[PDB]
Structures are given as C-alpha cells and as structure tokens.
Amino acid sequence: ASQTSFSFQRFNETNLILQRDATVSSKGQLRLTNVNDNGEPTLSSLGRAFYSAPIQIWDNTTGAVASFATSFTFNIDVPNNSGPADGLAFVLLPVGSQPKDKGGLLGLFNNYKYDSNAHTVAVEFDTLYNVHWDPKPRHIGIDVNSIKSIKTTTWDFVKGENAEVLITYDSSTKLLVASLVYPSLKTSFIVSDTVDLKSVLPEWVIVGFTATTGITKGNVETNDILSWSFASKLSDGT
Amino acid sequence: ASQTSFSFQRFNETNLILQRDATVSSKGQLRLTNVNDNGEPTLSSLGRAFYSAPIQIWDNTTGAVASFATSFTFNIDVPNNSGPADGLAFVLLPVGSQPKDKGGLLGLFNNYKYDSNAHTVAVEFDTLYNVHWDPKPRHIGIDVNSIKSIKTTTWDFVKGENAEVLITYDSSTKLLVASLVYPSLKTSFIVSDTVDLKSVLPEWVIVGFTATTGITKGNVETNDILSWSFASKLSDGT
Amino acid sequence: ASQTSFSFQRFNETNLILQRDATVSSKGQLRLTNVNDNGEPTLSSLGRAFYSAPIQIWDNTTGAVASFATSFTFNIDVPNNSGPADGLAFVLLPVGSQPKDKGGLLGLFNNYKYDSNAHTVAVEFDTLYNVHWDPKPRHIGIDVNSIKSIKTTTWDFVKGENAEVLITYDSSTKLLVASLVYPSLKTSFIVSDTVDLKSVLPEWVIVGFTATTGITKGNVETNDILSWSFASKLSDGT
Amino acid sequence: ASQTSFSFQRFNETNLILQRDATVSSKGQLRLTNVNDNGEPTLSSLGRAFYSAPIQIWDNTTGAVASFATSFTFNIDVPNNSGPADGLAFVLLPVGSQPKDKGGLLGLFNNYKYDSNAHTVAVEFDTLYNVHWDPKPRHIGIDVNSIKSIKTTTWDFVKGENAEVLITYDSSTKLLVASLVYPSLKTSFIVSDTVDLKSVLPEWVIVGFTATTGITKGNVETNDILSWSFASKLSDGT
Ligand SMILES: [Ca+2]
Ligand SMILES: [Ca+2]
Ligand SMILES: [Ca+2]
Ligand SMILES: [Ca+2]
Ligand SMILES: [Mn+2]
Ligand SMILES: [Mn+2]
Ligand SMILES: [Mn+2]
Ligand SMILES: [Mn+2]
C-alpha cells in the first residue's frame, strides 16, 4: 500500500543528508565521526547521516502504523592505549532534525532526562559507561525519547571487527527486535521490547545513523558504516 | 548490490520535489498541471514532480548500468468543448534539473532539435500533434535528448479513463519497453527501442514526471498521477 | 499473506514435473518438444513442464483471487525448408493434469469446441494457422477452456530470435495482459482481456509450459525455454 | 540468478510433503506430531513436513553456494501433569529423505554419534535434556550431521506461547544465525556458527520441519507451525 526499500553496498553523498563530521570516504564508507590524515579518530566528534527521502511511519486518518526492517554492517575500531567512546545508533527522527549534544548523548539529547517532545526512536550501540544512566557493561539499547534506554542487552564489544546488525519492527505486535553478530568471532547478541511509534514519532520521519566520539582523552573510536539496507511497509487498504 | 524500490498508492508532498504548477491534492493525487477551483484545467501550464532521493543509473569505475522498471496509473481528462494537449511523461533527468520550455516540448527542451547536453531520457504520452516533429495520431514515444522520439506507437487515447503504464529497462540488452493498458477499455499498447543510458544520463539522476497543457484555447487537459511504483538494481560485484 | 515467487536462469529436472517429450538439455535449457541428435526438431512431438509445487489461485472461504505475473524467454527455431508449427503456451491447469491431444491443440484440448470441464487458462504463441478456429496471421492469444482464444493479437514471428514474454494478471480488475518483445529486432506486441479465474480454475493449480510440433511434414519447430520467472500474491486478510 | 521464496499464513497439504504423523489441521495449522481428539498430544510420535519443490543449495560446476533465510511462528504446548519433549527443528535434507529414529534424535539420526553420510543441517529447538549429549537447560542448537549440536544457547521455554523464529545463512561468511522471540513476553534468544553447506548437503535439498514427542509417560508436547516463510538465492553468474 506504501512501500519503501533501499540497499547500499557502497555509499555516495548524493542520496544522503550529511550533518556535522559525517563524510563519505573515497572507499565508499560512511564515516560518521571525524578521522584525521593519519587514519586516527579525533575526540569531541559528532556526525549524523540520513537517507534523503523521508519515510512515512504512520497515518492518522487510517490509524495504520508501518512495519520496518533495517540491516547494516559497521566497524568500530579503537587506536592503541585508548578505550572506546561513545558509540553509534540507528535512528528515526522528525524531518529536518538538527544535531543535539555530543559525547554520551550521541547527538540525540541535551541531557539525560526523558523528553516526551524529543520524538526519537533509536537502537544504540554503546561503548562507554555513563555513570548517571548506563548499565556498567557495553550494551545494545532501545532508546525511546531518552538516552536512558528502556531495555538493554550485554554487548561484548570488540574493536576493528565488522558487525552485522538487524533491526525489525512489527507494528501488529509493537515489537522492536535488534540483533548483532560478529562473523569472525561467530558471536551474537539480541534485545527486544515494545515501542508505540504512533505516540512517539511524527507521521513522517528520516532514517539513518548518528555517532559521537568521547570528550575526555583516551576514549575515542572510528564509527564507520560499510553497508546499509532498509525496508518499510505501510498499509492504507488497497 | 545497489537496490532502490518505492511504491505509492497515495501521494504526499513530503517525499517529493515539486516544480512549478505540480501539486498534491487533498485526495492524495499528484496533479502535475494546474487546475482551478472548479476542477478546470488551465492553459499554458507546466508541472514536474520527482522522488526526493536521487538514483544511481551507472558506475564509472565498475562500468555497470542499472536496470529499472516503473509502473504508474495516470488520468488525463479533457473538459467539454476542448481537445487534449500536450501530454505527460516519465522522465530521467540530472540532479537539480530545472523545467524547460512549455507546450509540446513537455518542459524538457527549449527547441525541437537534438540536444546532446539535455541529458534526457523520457517516455512520453503525447496527446497533441505538433506539425514539425510528431506523427499524426496520438502516440506513446521514447525520447532520447530530443522531443522527436526515436520510436513511437499509436495510442488510442480516451479521456477520463485510467491508464496503467509499465516501463521496463534491461541494461544487458539496452532495451526500453513501454506499455499502456486501459483496464476498462481492455485495450493495450506497447513500444520498445534501444537506449544507451551510460552515454546520455549522468551517473546520478532524479526520477519522476513532467506534464504541460496546450497554449492555444481549445487544447487542454488534466495530468494526474494516481499511483506510482519504481525499482532499480545496479550491480557492483559483491 | 500467501506469496510464492521463483526465478530460474538455468533449468534442471529436479524441481520440475516433466511430461512426455519435455526434457532439460545438458546446457540447462527446457526443451519442450523433441530434438534429435543432429539438432533437428521432430514432427508430432508433445511436451509439458510444470513447477513442482502447486500454487493457490483462489480461496473459496475468503473469496480472494491471486494476482500473478510470469516472465520468460523462449526460442522457437525452424529448420531449413520448413514452416513453423504449432507453438508453445504458458498454462494454468489443475493439479495432476495429463497431456491431451497434440498438433494445433497445443496438448491442452481434445477438440476445438468450448469445454467448461477443461479448467484451462493459457496464453498461447501460435505459429501455425488452423483453418477451423485461428486467425490467418501468426498470433498471441488468451485461451480460456477453448483453443479458440477469447482475444488475439498479431505476432510478427521470426525464427531463431530470443523472445522475452511478460504475462500479468490483476485480480482487482480481472485483467490478463500478455506482451512479447524481440530484444534484437526491437519489435514488441501486446494483448489484453479480462478473465474470471474464480469460475474457470480450481483453488490450487500448476504453472508452466506446453508445446507441440506439427503433424504434417514441412511444419515443425523447436520449442525452448531459456529462463523463467513467476510470482503470485494472494490476500487472506492478515 | 536462481531465486525461490514463499510465504504462508495458513497451511494446506496440497503443496507439502507430509511424513508419518505430520498433519495439516482444519484451522490451517501444520501439526507435526500427533494430537488426539481431546487436544492431547500422544507419546512416541514423529512427524516431518517439507515444501513440495526441492531447493538448490549449491552448484558443482560454478561452485557457488546459496544464501537462504527462513522465518516461522511455532507453538509448543504441554498438557498438565507433564513436561515437554522432545522438540522441533527446521531442516535441510536430501531429496526423498525418510524419517529416522524417534525421541531425542528428532527423526533425523539413529544414534547420537556423528555421521558424515547423514547430510543433515538443522536448527533444533530442544525441550528435553538428554544426558549423553545435551546441555542441561532447554536450548536452541545448530546441528550438523549429528544430534550433538556444534553450538547452542539457553532458551527459556514457556509452554503455550507463540514463538517467532528467524534463521539466516550468509554463504560468503558461511555464517548461520538463528533467533527466537516471544512477542508477548518480550524475551529473545540468539545463536550463530559457521556451517559449510557444500561439504555437508547435496546440490538439491528439501526444506522443512521435523518434530517428536517423548517415549516416556510424563514427557510430551504439541509441535505446531502456524506460519512459514522461506527465501533462497543462488548465483550462476548472470
Ligand atoms: Ca554510554
Ligand atoms: Ca506532441
Ligand atoms: Ca494454431
Ligand atoms: Ca534433547
Ligand atoms: Mn547506553
Ligand atoms: Mn510526440
Ligand atoms: Mn491460435
Ligand atoms: Mn539438544
């Protein structure tokens, strides 16, 4: 009834809305945070990227909510004598949404309080423990209007390893499932919770990614997206 | 490898680039040319509509060309005591492409001469005979860099009836096939001819529609798109 | 809701139901009629190949009818000093159906009268004119329980040239559309009419091909399928 | 190049190969193991069901391996005064494969030893702990030519609840991933390992399910499949 799907092996900036430090390298890689000339990630970075066509997530007339699935391969690497920070997230935001506060707030919030008017659904890949909200181990978290996830799962983060993610949303069950696998480590992690899109997001949203590096020294990482697939389906009724 | 596909039964301006007279009605119909308050098509009208995300048609490195297919339902109506003009088209144009001269040039050209710098591939639905270039009967025609179509086929145009269009392009054979059916009238029409996309179109193009009304009194039509689907695949090689 | 689609560039007998003279050559070609060791087609040959899984076309409980589409590439060649006969057809038949009479009856019917107990929907590619029912020119026809097509269209048959075919059925409008293209000759043909599947076919059917060579010397051809794609969708109401 | 996908919300025997106790109920549920007239599952049952068309997993000429995905929703329920047993499994088996020993071997193996001639890849959902090979808690397992799974993960089995299963296989990484979600409980589980299809399975296989009930009083369950989707893709090279 209304179908959108896109699939990219290599990125080009032509069909993307890049914000802040988010660039497209000559290799075709979506490098969300800054990396200098020597192949080294820099501190205090922030970058967001989006598919240039907004997607309809729901319709107020019909009452219908879209089911969507997305899959992406990312590489987060850390230079020597450093820990990682701060991570990356897949997001659904209002059209023309502008970057927020850097570091641990991932460019999505300005504080660690809940914001009913944030209109933000995100699946986070956290690489840093923030004492005021995060669980102690590194995690995958579902974020609904807060940096303090509604549900998390332990993620055994390993630097330099390609990570293959699948995020699915079934509107009939309201279940958002997110999974990560490391093909070389053969490891796998999954998290799931119910999210009521209709009450959180606007009818039209932009889809894509956001990443930030740490502000303190010794906490930094690359945040590269290597491939992306997205598909949503919204029923209007023949 | 690089897949893109979208399908709409109702239109909204949120995921479209609209140009000149093109509007989306409150019913959810992409109305390309101007219509006054009484539902009457107006003369000298030109409108263009595009999907907000550009599509990649070929790659310079890999040398590959995309295959694409598009289907849509259009309704051309003509008011009483008038004839039809000038027709509408499915178009592939450069990113940021601006409208051209109106009338029987369908907003794609400034004259009826070949123009290698036009970078224009279009499937036209011609409702008015232009002495200088068109065949006499109303026709479906394949346009490559010129309003004089490289091939045409007789289209028995009937006003106010829904026409269902399928346009397919095989890159392996370079064949562009365009067909039209009136599900009520049970009539079908088809035209096919070779097009080399690599030599005519830039790597990245916008996809969508153009339409114009007649400039002389007695020649005018509505140019409405009711539903639209598009899909294109481009191989990179894993 | 109930979706089935397949696509084969190369054929193998493992997933097909072959009948009579139908064979899969060592190249991966579906050779519907018989060909000797010299590479010559034999007279009075009959073959039929189907997909090994039956497909649901309609539901008696919901009343819902499937929308389907099939696309394939066939090669019909005529040896020296001969005419072409009789043709091949894409068919929908009851599960477990047996071959019928050969010749200008394409292995589908016993006679050239209408038969409501036949349960046969077919798109024919008729190369030989049969005085008793066919039109004089070579044609594409839509067969419903009779070899006398309900609708036909002229087909400029050329031997030894690859022919790409698209057959689409839309249950909302009950319209069946059939087109043929010759990629190298740039020629194209189309035929369309409505068909009420709900009254003709059983709920479950088999899909595939049927072919025959002529019974009289100097009237023979090859009937080959080089690739096949099929898709059908059937709503049940979530 | 060679693609097959199918999707069913209701079942019918027409397009499935049923073995032993496997039955398709009036409600349209694939009931793998036997259920008496009260609703009670019976002891020592075995049932297997398969899609009628065989699926090609690899080609010996090109050496190419297929990537496949499958999702199903199953229901396992236990009658009062009993524990569960023995489980159900999604399987890939050689064409014409016949059921093996019942009980904890799930109708795939004759003992609990590795058998290279088994030609059996299966994702199990084990509800009964077997001292000689199983991990203590109820698990999801990846089986390769042996009931002793190459990798497992704890699965918190809850009777009576619909479970949604996704199984993906990427032929480039040789990685198989299997996940289970309980939509109503919001719980979710995942496991992944490498499997070399080319060396284990034959060119063509039948895809589907197998299930067994316990041989000892007090250990029994229903093994119901409520919906099924399967997709595979094998590249010949254009
Ligand atoms: Ca954090
Ligand atoms: Ca004209
Ligand atoms: Ca004939
Ligand atoms: Ca067990
Ligand atoms: Mn966190
Ligand atoms: Mn024209
Ligand atoms: Mn005929
Ligand atoms: Mn086990």
Numbering used by the authors:
A (entry chain B), B (entry chain D), C (entry chain C), D (entry chain A): 22 to 259
Please give sentences taken from the publication describing this entry.
In an attempt to obtain such “snapshots” of biantennary N-glycan, we selected for crystallographic studies two unrelated plant lectins, Calsepa from Calystegia sepium and PHA-E from Phaseolus vulgaris, which show 4- to 5-fold increase in affinity toward bisected biantennary N-glycans compared with control non-bisected glycan. The most populated conformation of bisected N-glycan is termed the ‘back-fold’ conformation, in which the α1–6 arm is flipped back towards the stem region of N-glycan (GlcNAcβ1–4GlcNAc). In summary, our study provides the first atomic structures of a flipped-back conformation of bisected N-glycan bound to two specific lectins. Thus both proteins, PHA-E as well as Calsepa, are specifically ‘back-fold conformer selective’, rather than broad bisecting GlcNAc-selective lectins.
PHA-E is a legume lectin (120 kDa as tetramer) which is widely used for detecting bisected glycans. Unfortunately, electron density was observed for only two sugar residues from one branch, which made it impossible to decipher the conformation of the whole glycan. We have now determined the crystal structure of PHA-E in complex with a longer bisected N-glycan derivative (glycan 2 in Fig. 4A) at 3.0 Å resolution. Eight PHA-E subunits and eight bisected glycan molecules are packed in the asymmetric unit. PHA-E forms a tetramer and each monomer binds to one bisected glycan in its primary binding site. The structure contains eight carbohydrate residues out of ten. The α1–6 branch and bisecting GlcNAc interact with PHA-E, while the α1–3 branch and chitobiose unit are exposed to solvent. The only hydrogen bonds are between two hydroxyl groups, OH3 and OH4 of GlcNAc-7 and the side chain of Asp122 in the loop B region. The putative H2 and H4 hydrogen atoms of GlcNAc-7 can make van der Waals contact with H1, H3 and H5 hydrogen atoms of GlcNAc-5 of the α1–3 branch. Moreover, the nitrogen atom of GlcNAc-5′ in the α1–6 branch is located within hydrogen bond distance of OH3 of GlcNAc-2 in the chitobiose unit. As in the case of Calsepa, the back-fold conformation appears critical for simultaneous recognition of both the α1–6 branch and GlcNAc-7.
